[PDB]
């Protein structure tokens, strides 16, 4: 409840400052500008490597999501099984990284 008050206050202060920033110099009548970039009008070429690093982020972020309950999982009574599955998950993250390595997926953004 106080959390929603805080979030709403931060959004309100940000919207206040952004509106004042967009509209305090719009009181000025400075001049009207016509103003008739590295690329001129060429279409943005698709970069395959940027997409590959975004999907590699997404899959390793999912493996992170599996890793996230480990401080609570260390409190279990089945510690041998828990330690085995934790080492197996971090090892599978390392194997996904090794396959991403050796198949040249981490190249030109290495």
């Amino acid at each position: 409840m106080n959390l929603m008050i805080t979030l709403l206050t931060n959004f309100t202060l940000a919207t206040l400052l952004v509106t004042i920033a967009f509209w305090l110099p719009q009181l000025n009548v400075y001049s009207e500008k016509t103003s008739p970039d590295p690329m001129g009008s060429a279409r943005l070429p698709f970069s395959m490597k940027f997409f590959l690093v975004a999907i590699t982020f997404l899959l390793f972020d999912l493996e992170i999501a599996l890793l996230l309950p480990l401080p609570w999982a260390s409190q279990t009574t089945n510690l041998n099984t828990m330690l085995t599955m934790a080492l197996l998950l971090i090892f599978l993250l390392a194997v996904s990284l090794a396959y991403e390595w050796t198949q040249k997926g981490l190249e030109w953004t290495e």
């Binding site: 400075y30 001049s31 500008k33 103003s35």
Partner: protein, 156 residues
């Protein structure tokens, strides 16, 4: 009256903030850029006046035209000037920016950047010393200081 005093204090405030936070574009053309760097160097140190170099003309306040403006470059210089947000200022630095200088009678040189952009401070020299460029920047600050924007706005 009272509102005259209010707009006088507001003019003093906005002129103070504009002259004490000048941001030139890091943009040199010829030999004057070397001395403009010496005015950025530790001996003169423009940053202690609130004068910093910024790469883009979008976050810049003054264009120090420091070097020879040729015919091949003048539309690029005008485009740089047209991308600057107002209030934007121009400091012509050196004899070629001022009036062509040593290349005045050349087929390829714009005889003075004031054919291309409006110029606020003309700094003379070939090159002017870095101390002389800092003199021109402080004269620009004093020119911004005596601007009367809100007084003229209140009287119009």
């Amino acid at each position: 009256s009272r509102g005259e005093y209010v707009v006088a204090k507001l003019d003093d405030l906005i002129n103070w903030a504009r002259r004490s936070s000048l941001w030139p574009m890091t943009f040199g053309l010829a030999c004057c850029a070397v001395e403009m760097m010496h005015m950025a160097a530790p001996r003169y140190d423009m940053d202690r006046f609130g004068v910093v170099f910024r790469a883009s003309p979008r976050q810049s306040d003054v264009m120090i035209v420091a070097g020879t403006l040729t015919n091949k470059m003048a539309p690029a210089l005008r485009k740089v000037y047209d991308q600057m947000p107002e209030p934007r200022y121009v400091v012509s630095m050196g004899s070629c920016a001022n009036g062509g200088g040593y290349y005045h009678y050349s087929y390829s040189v714009v005889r003075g950047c004031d054919r291309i952009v409006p110029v606020d401070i003309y700094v003379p020299g070939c090159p002017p010393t870095a101390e002389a460029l800092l003199y021109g920047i402080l004269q620009l600050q004093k020119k911004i200081k005596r601007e009367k924007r809100l007084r003229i706005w209140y009287r119009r």
